[PDB]
Amino acid sequence: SMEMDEKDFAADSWSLAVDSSFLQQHKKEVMKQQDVIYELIQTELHHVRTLKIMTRLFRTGMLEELHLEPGVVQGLFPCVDELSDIHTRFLSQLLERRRQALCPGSTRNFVIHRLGDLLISQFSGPSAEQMCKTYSEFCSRHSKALKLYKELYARDKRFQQFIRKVTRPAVLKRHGVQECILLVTQRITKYPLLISRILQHSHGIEEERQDLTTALGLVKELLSNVDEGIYQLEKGARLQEIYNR
Amino acid sequence: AIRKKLVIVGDGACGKTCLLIVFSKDQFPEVYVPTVFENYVADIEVDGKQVELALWDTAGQEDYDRLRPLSYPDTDVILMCFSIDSPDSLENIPEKWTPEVKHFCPNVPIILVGNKKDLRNDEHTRRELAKMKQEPVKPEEGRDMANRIGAFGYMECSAKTKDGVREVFEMATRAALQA
Ligand SMILES: CCOc1ccccc1N1CCNCC1
Numbered sequence: 001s002m003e004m005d006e007k008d009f010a011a012d013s014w015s016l017a018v019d020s021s022f023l024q025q026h027k028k029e030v031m032k033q034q035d036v037i038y039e040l041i042q043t044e045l046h047h048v049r050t051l052k053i054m055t056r057l058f059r060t061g062m063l064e065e066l067h068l069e070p071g072v073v074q075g076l077f078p079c080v081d082e083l084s085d086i087h088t089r090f091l092s093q094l095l096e097r098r099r100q101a102l103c104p105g106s107t108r109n110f111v112i113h114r115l116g117d118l119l120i121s122q123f124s125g126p127s128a129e130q131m132c133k134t135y136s137e138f139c140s141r142h143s144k145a146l147k148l149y150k151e152l153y154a155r156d157k158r159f160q161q162f163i164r165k166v167t168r169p170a171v172l173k174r175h176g177v178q179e180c181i182l183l184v185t186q187r188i189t190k191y192p193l194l195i196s197r198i199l200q201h202s203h204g205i206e207e208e209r210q211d212l213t214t215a216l217g218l219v220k221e222l223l224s225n226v227d228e229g230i231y232q233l234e235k236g237a238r239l240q241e242i243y244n245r
Numbered sequence: 246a247i248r249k250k251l252v253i254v255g256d257g258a259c260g261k262t263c264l265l266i267v268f269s270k271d272q273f274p275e276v277y278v279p280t281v282f283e284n285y286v287a288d289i290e291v292d293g294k295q296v297e298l299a300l301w302d303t304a305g306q307e308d309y310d311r312l313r314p315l316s317y318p319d320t321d322v323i324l325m326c327f328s329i330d331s332p333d334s335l336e337n338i339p340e341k342w343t344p345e346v347k348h349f350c351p352n353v354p355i356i357l358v359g360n361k362k363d364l365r366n367d368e369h370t371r372r373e374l375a376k377m378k379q380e381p382v383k384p385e386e387g388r389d390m391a392n393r394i395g396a397f398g399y400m401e402c403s404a405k406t407k408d409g410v411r412e413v414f415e416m417a418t419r420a421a422l423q424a
């Protein structure tokens with residue numbers, strides 16, 4: 001992540017990120033709502049960072065340093081550029097809503113009152129169609145990616161040295177190749193939990209409660225479509241094993 | 246230090262997310278309790294052996310039968326959770342969770358964990374459960390369920406007070422290290 005955003009989301013909560021004199025001006029219910037919105041944006045910033053480790057550190061590093069057979073890097077990192085485009089765009093919209101809400105003279109004091117409409121836009125129309133198509137493809141290639149990674153790490157010396165080299169720093173502790181893949185797969189199922197908790201503290205404005213209710217339904221529809229569209233691909237599995245599913 | 250993977254499973258109200266948060270911070274959050282848990286790698290030394298224990302939550306995956314099993318590959322130990330304030334969460338252990346974990350994680354040790362043990366003697370909890378003809382799970386009911394499902398062991402803890410939390414993860418590490 002870039003330093004400006006890391007610092008804006010360094011605190012454990014919105015209530016610790018804003019100036020204490022600004023915090024004191026809000027009702028308890030507003031603080032509760034803002035703390036959960038801040039967790040949604042903070043976790044989305046970290047998710048985009050996970051995708052940047054996959055595209056830039058791993059994928060591009062393997063293309064520039066290793067001599068892997070064609071189709072191997074794509075097999076290890078299926079759909080990573082499409083996933084990066086989807087979430088970098090969503091993160092950009094969340095961060096622009098925060099930036100517009102800042103008080104003049106401050107780079108940390110804000111309240112986001114209208115998140116619902118942004119979530120309806122993200123989880124409907126062409127952007128929801130692209131999220132559904134991309135996660136149905138990625139999650140169906142999850143077992144195949146893990147198996148290809150394990151085979152290469154166990155049999156290719158230069159590949160094992162590369163992985164050990166780039167994952168040695170302490171900041172990569174939670175972000176090995178397989179760990180990145182499961183962080184990405186699990187991201188989509190975090191959204192309902194976060195949206196439901198924001199909705200719990202958004203009754204103050206009826207239009208906002210209605211918009212978050214619509215967004216939660218759209219996210220659950222997307223998850224149900226992705227879940228029904230998954231079938232694990234397996235290298236070497238014969239047609240007979242597939243049509244006898 | 247060898248790397249091992251832990252996954253926690255159980256119903257949405259079992260307290261699995263809170264348990265991972267409290268263990269990973271060695272603290273129940275004083276300002277904000279997070280809604281979600283991403284992952285974590287804990288450095289644990291148990292009985293003289295150093296392990297890096299990767300921790301994962303299945304919260305949010307309960308309704309998605311094709312997405313949820315993607316969390317299971319290469320798991321070394323399962324924490325199978327229920328809440329002591331919810332006999333309904335204990336009833337779902339042999340019905341759904343046990344056959345699923347046995348299928349996707351064959352021969353992986355399962356530790357059955359009774360969460361929220363601080364609510365066993367909470368008056369509000371006892372009054373609320375009595376309306377549905379229920380009562381908090383007794384320790385012998387937890388041990389019997391663990392015995393029946395072939396669990397490696399039975400343990401209890403409270404994420405609120407931290408009691409028993411360290412012990413659960415140290416035992417999970419010992420289970421992960423066994424042949
Ligand atoms: C007190 C023992 O601490 C550990 C326990 C398990 C794994 C690693 C460590 N340390 C030693 C190496 N570097 C990371 C921390």
Ligand SMILES: CCOc1ccccc1N1CCNCC1
Pocket residue numbers: 310314344345348
């Ligand atoms: C999601 C948990 O489902 C199970 C639970 C117990 C045994 C088998 C299954 N599978 C067997 C093949 N895949 C679909 C269901």
